[model samples]
Structure formats: structure tokens, C-alpha cells
Target chain A: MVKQIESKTAFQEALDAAGDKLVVVDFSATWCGPCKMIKPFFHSLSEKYSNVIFLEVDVNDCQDVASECEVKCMPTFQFFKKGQKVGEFSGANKEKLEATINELV
Target chain B: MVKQIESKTAFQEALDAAGDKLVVVDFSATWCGPCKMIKPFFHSLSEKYSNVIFLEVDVNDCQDVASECEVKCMPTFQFFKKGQKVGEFSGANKEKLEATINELV
Candidate 1:
């Protein structure tokens, strides 16, 4: 299941619990139309990997979460491992997002 | 003003009304977090640009609109003129989006 980031404290806590696991986050917004396009694609990845964690961060509703992530663009993807950023990229490119996730696999 | 595109026919009509004006349509999704981040910036541009028409496309609600535009990415900005797409780009790059809008201006 894809978790939505509502609180900065919860996000930090989740990060702590996801030790050594790969966490992929989709940092997008409600008004961004393209973000809707990539939602299913990103969420499907979570089901494919039990060891992986998928998250959705709303830049508007979750300002502190986004600010902590330093995400300026919509549909940005950040990959984390053991609570540390392993890799990341912005945009709604399925090929690139899949490749990056595949690399970690 | 940023018009939310609902139907393909209405969008076509709006396109007809915006003839000769630079129409910037933002294609995004409902669950997209980044899409929300760029809302103010994109809308502000509409206020700044009197010669340009701003519109929003919801991929979920307006699949036909998105498929017609061949929009595969979230937060995509497609520029149109005389009912024909002239230029476009994806992602949430403010500098690049500004530069593109400036070029049109």
C-alpha cells in the first residue's frame, strides 16, 4: 500500500522504522495534473516488492515534509535506503523511474 | 484565468476562443503531490500574462483530453496557438517554464 505523508514526525518515524529497506517517495501535489498520471504506476511498484516502501508526499498539505525533502518540482521521486537518500530524480518519466527502481533491485 | 478542462468538446471550444493567444495548459492528476506545488506559480503567470490563456487538465477526470494531447507525464505544460499546440515541456522547472513563457511574450 502507498502511504501518504501527513505529518513530518510520522514521516521521520517511518524512515526510522524502514531501516535497510528501500523507500520510494512520490513528491507531488493536488493541482498537478501530471502527478495523477503517474500515481498507479508508482503504487504498483510497491506491490511488486515487499521489501520496498512507497510513499506519497503532498507539497501543499505537507509543507514541512516537502521542505525537509527540498522538493521544488512536482512528481519528483526520491529513493531512500536505511533512511539515507540513495538516489533521486524529478519529473514524470516512467522509463527513468522504472530504471532507477530497477537499479536498486 | 486558469480554466479547468473538463470535456474534450469544451476544451476544444476554449481553444477556439483562445485563438492567437498563447494557451498554456497544465496536465496533472488528482493524487499528484507535485502538481499542487506548482499551482500558485502557474496561476500567477496567468495574471501576469494577459495575452496568454491558462488551463488545467485533470488526467483522471479528463482522460480524453490527456490522450488527445498524448500527455504521459504529470505536471506538463503544453503551449498552444490558433488551436494548435506550438511548444511544450514536462516537469516542474520554474526557471525553464519562465523562460519558455518569456519567449512567448
Candidate 2:
């Protein structure tokens, strides 16, 4: 199952737990209109990419995580390997989203 | 005379070049690095905020003005009047940046 990291410590824990697997972190917010609009698509992609460890981060609930990641906008997706960031996507465009996922996967 | 908005149509032409008074937007980014250690406290608070109208944006040569001013970090501060952008200050603390320039001077 996917996990939610609510704090910086939890985010670190998730990174540690990822081990050799690739971890995809999705930074989002509940009150953001654009974030809500992309919810379904994210879920769909998660289902399709079942082998990847998916993590959801609520920016408001975890300001520290947001700050650490330098997340400027909603729906910022970060790709991590072992425990370091490899790449990321910061917009809501479907093509860009798919391309990022494809690169990581 | 402080102006520099390299795109997005000159950030709406400095919000119509401050038709009245207040207009402070400092969205920075030059390879990041905590925004170059706060850039000397934003140039000593823009030389003691001499009558507002201070703007300096450089987010990767203006990636759509750092995506329409939703800039994640690297010294994001926006506080305008008579043209939009009311309050801002994303990170980098100097006593809350002199109380948001003393409530927009």
C-alpha cells in the first residue's frame, strides 16, 4: 500500500524504508484546487505502476517536508533512488507527468 | 527606478510600473543554494526600503516568472498594491523581514 508522510522525520523514514526500490513522492495539498483536479489521474498512475513505492505528502501537514524539498507548487512529484532525489516534475500536464514516470520506471 | 522583470511581459510591466506606490516583488533564483544565503539580507532590505516599489525577479531567467509567482523558494517575497499581490515572504527570516516592510510601509 502507498504511504503518507506527515513530517520531515516521517519523510526521512520513508526514504530509509525505500531501500533499493525506487520511491516516488507526490507533494500535494488538500485546499489546492489544482491538486484536487489531479487526484484521480495520480491514483490511476499509481495503480499502473504498482511495483514502485508511492508516497503522498500533504504540504500543509508537512511544511518541513515541503521546505526541504523546495516544493513551490502543488502536485510536485519527486523521484528518489536508494535515498536521494533523481528527478522530478512540477506541473499538472498529463504528458509531462507520464514522461516523468516513464523515465523513472 | 528599481526594475527588472525579464519576461511574462515584464511581469505585467511591473504591475503597470506601480501606478500609485507600494510594489515589492523579489522572487529570486540563481542556481538556488538557499537563494545565495539570502543575498545579503536582500541588499540590506533594499537600502532600508526607500519608499517602496522594489522588484527583482530572476528565476531561471524567468520561467514564466517562476510559474506565475508561485515560486517555491530562493527568496520569494511579493507585496504589491493597486495591481495585485498583497502579501508574501517565503522563508529567509530577518525578524519577519521587518514585519513585511512594516505592513507595506
Candidate 3:
């Protein structure tokens, strides 16, 4: 299961806590259709990749975090390492998401 | 990835090919809502457990297989080993499905 970050502070803490480790953050909303579609795949990925940190931030709940991360879309996936953003992409492309994770991990 | 069994012959062949290995067959329908929800998880499970054979049979396409297996539900999972029916359960319960697989595998 992906850890839900409810606040900007929580998100920052989680990123810092995952220092040197790959942190995959999903910026999604509850009402987003594509987000809902990819959510199961995302959860399964989290289970498969135990070494990677999976976090979920609801754009509606954590607008500050979404704005800070510059997430303009509903299903934006951001990869972080050493508390820095390393890669990102928007939408629910499962293959690209998995491939990107494989490349970065 | 789950192999789509379009015919009863293909399903039988896949089961025979598995021999002693665990063969998890998901009997689903194209219009089933719960079936769609669990499909992604099923696919990921296939990737995670490469040792097991994952199969997807459309109830409409393989009515004979469904009737022979005595599957009455929209999303039924039947476990087989040594080309024989070992166990079966119905629904889109992810935890139960994975736990059942873990127990059998």
C-alpha cells in the first residue's frame, strides 16, 4: 500500500526519510478517472518493489505539496532520490511508469 | 501477463503444459465490473509469480470451460496442479486471492 501524505510537511518528511532511496510520489485526486484506473497498478508496483518508497498525495487534500511539486495534472508521478526530484511524468501509462521505475531503480 | 484462453482446448493444453506447477485460472467476463477492477492486480500477480501459470478465460468465449469448472460467478478463480482441479473461489477479493495463491504456491 502507498503511504498517503496529507500535508506538505508530511510529504517533505517522507522524502527526507527516504534519502538515498527511490521515492515514487503519485499526485492524484479522488475524482480523477485515469487516476482511479492506474491506482491498482500503482499499489501492485509498491508491493512488487519493496525497496522503493511509494507515497500518494491527493491534490485536493495537499494542494500545497502539489503546487510545490508543480503538478498540473491529476495523475502525475514524481520520482525523488536524496530528497530531490529526479524524474516525473503525468498520466496513467503503466508501461512507461514501470519502465521509468526500472531505469531509475 | 495472463494468457487469454479463447477455447476450451487452449485451456486444457495450458493446464496440461503446467503439469506439476500451479495454474491459476481467472474466469471473467468482458462486461463484469468487479472483474475489471481486479484485472490489474491479477496481471501484477502474474508478473510477481512467474513460476505459476496465469490464465484468463472469458466466460462468454469459453462457456464450456466455465460450465465444466462449475463456475457460477462473474469473476471466479480456479487453482489447478498436475492438470487437476485443486481449489476454487469467486469474486474480486484481492487479499483473499493473493493469500490463497500464497498458500497453494
Candidate 4:
């Protein structure tokens, strides 16, 4: 299931909860149209890869987590493992995202 | 996060979602008073143990899953590991609940 990050604490909780698994955090703004577009694709990946933890963070709502993750764009994707940031990408590219999910994770 | 089970599919999703860690499903009925009492306690445990996936199931809402879980009592808790039922308890005893989480999971 996709979990929405409500607070920095909840964000840390999901990160810590990942344990040995992979965590993909989608950092986006409410007004960003591209953020809206890639969301369903990200969600579908969450279902396809049930083992990974998929989280959504509204950049406006969770700047603490967003800034901490070094997010600078509207559709910044942060990849984490064992509660540490392993990789990240900006902008939307479904093929690149899926490939990163396969290779890095 | 404590996920509320809406259907048998969601229940299994939570189960399959657990992967390697422990999963605790609290089978409860809305009419059952004790079921209400232990909810916060269950939620607390979910926070205390972030790795474990804690889920709540309304017995009356989803009878198919309720029956499949063999829930004969209110506030029945079934523990799973690797998508298999490893242990279960019938009543709301915080000590036993914690012990079951410790001992079985």
C-alpha cells in the first residue's frame, strides 16, 4: 500500500520501518502538474513491487523531509535503503524510473 | 502505521506486504466494547514496533475474512510470518499480547 507522509516523524517511521527493504519517496508540490501525472505510475509500481515501501510527500507540507532529502524540483524521487538516501532523480521518465527501481533497488 | 483492513484482499495485501517481518491483525467488531478499548493499545504497539505491520479488521464488515481467520471472539488477534499464521490470541490482555509479539513473532 502507498503511505502518505503526514509529518517528519511519520516519514522517519516509514523509513525506519523499511528495515532491509527499499523505500521510494515521491516528493512533489500540490500545484505541480507533472507531480500529478507520475503519481498513478508510481502507485502502479508500488503494487507491482509490493515489497518496496512507496511514500508520498507534499513538498509544501513536508519541507523538513523534502529539504532533508535534497529535493530541488517538483517531481523529485528519492530512493532510500536502511533509512539512508541511496539515490535520487528529478523530473519524470517512466522507463528510467522503472530501470532505476530494478537496478538500484 | 496501523492499516485498517477493508476487504479480504486488503487483509491479504497487508499479509503479503509484511514480507519477512511480523504482522498483527486485530479482528474486532464495532458492537464489541472491549474491541474499542484495546485499539489505542494496539496502535501504540504499532508505533513501538515500527517493523511490524499492524492491521485492524472489522469482523462485521468483512465476514469472509473474519470467518477465514476463524475469529470466534471479539478482539481476536492473529499473528503472521511470511504470509502464514504463526500464532493467535483470543482476548485483550496487554501482557499476553506483548508476550505473543515477543515470543512468537
Top candidate (DockQ):
2
Q: What interface RMSD does every candidate have? A: 7.3, 7.9, 17.3, 20.1
What are the per-model numbers of colliding residue pairs? 17, 0, 0, 0
Q: Rate the local accuracy (lDDT) of all candidates.
A: 0.80, 0.73, 0.82, 0.79
List DockQ, one per candidate, in order: 0.09, 0.10, 0.01, 0.01
RMSD of each: 5.7, 9.9, 16.6, 18.9
Off by over 4 Å in 4: B1-105
Residue range B14-62, candidate 3, lDDT tens digits: 8888878899999875555677789999999999999999999876666
Q: Best candidate per lDDT, number?
A: 3
lDDT of 1 by residue, A1-105 (tens): 899878888889888988788889898766566788889888887888778888888776776776667665667899998778989887789899878887985
Error (Å) of candidate 3 at residue A43 is: 0.3
Residue-level error in angstroms, candidate 4, position A47: 0.7
List where candidate 1 sits over 4 angstroms from the true fold.
A1-105
Q: Judged by lDDT relative to the true structure, which candidate is superior, 2 or 3?
A: 3
A4-89 in candidate 2: lDDT tens per residue?
A: 77778888887897778778888875544566677788778778877778889976677667776877656788999988889987
Encode model 1's per-residue lDDT on B16-56: one tens digit a residue: 98767888889875545677778889889888888888899
Higher-TM-score candidate of 2 and 3: 2
> How well is each residue in B28-105 modelled by candidate 2, as lDDT tens digits?
655445656767776777677777777788766776666656665457788878887778877667688678778777
Best-performing candidate as measured by TM-score: 2
Q: What's the C-alpha lDDT at position B4 in model 4?
A: 83
Residue by residue across B1-105, what tens digits does model 4's lDDT show?
A: 789888888777777767899988888755455667788899999889987888888765786786666555566888899988899877778899998898865
Scanning candidate 3 chain B in windows of ten residues, the lowest lDDT window is B65-74
TM-scores for all candidates: the values are 0.56, 0.57, 0.50, 0.49
